[PDB]
Amino acid sequence: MKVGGNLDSKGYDIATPKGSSLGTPVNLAVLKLSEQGVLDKLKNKWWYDKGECTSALSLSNVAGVFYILVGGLGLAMLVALIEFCYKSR
């Protein structure tokens, strides 16, 4: 898991050659895309949509004593039936 906040700030941007006619309208396009919210849609779509993913004592902390108690009860029953059968015979 990622835990906490981002230690610093960076970013990913579209890179174009120095002095190109494609810079200003690609910048306008990416800003319009961000304002239209489709950029967040893409982020959620491939980070989460195509993803693949108390204080009180629990019973598991004391299950062993329950097992021991039930085993003792069973052994006591076994002893009682053994004694009964022996006395009857």
């Binding site: 700030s9 910048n27 306008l28 800003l31 304002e35 204080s55």
Partner: protein, 50 residues
């Protein structure tokens, strides 16, 4: 030059030029700092699970 917390928007980029953002921020939630809640009536059973 404008040196202040100005949000970079499409219209502002249409009229003026913005440098790369010197500090990033977003929409988040502010709630009152939590305080110790009054214990329930049957709170003596809390140490052991139901």
């Amino acid at each position: 030059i404008a040196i202040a917390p100005l949000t970079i928007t499409l219209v502002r980029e249409e009229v003026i030029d913005f440098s790369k953002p010197f500090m990033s921020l977003g929409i988040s939630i502010m709630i009152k700092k939590p305080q110790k809640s009054k214990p329930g009536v049957f709170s003596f059973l809390d140490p052991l699970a139901y």
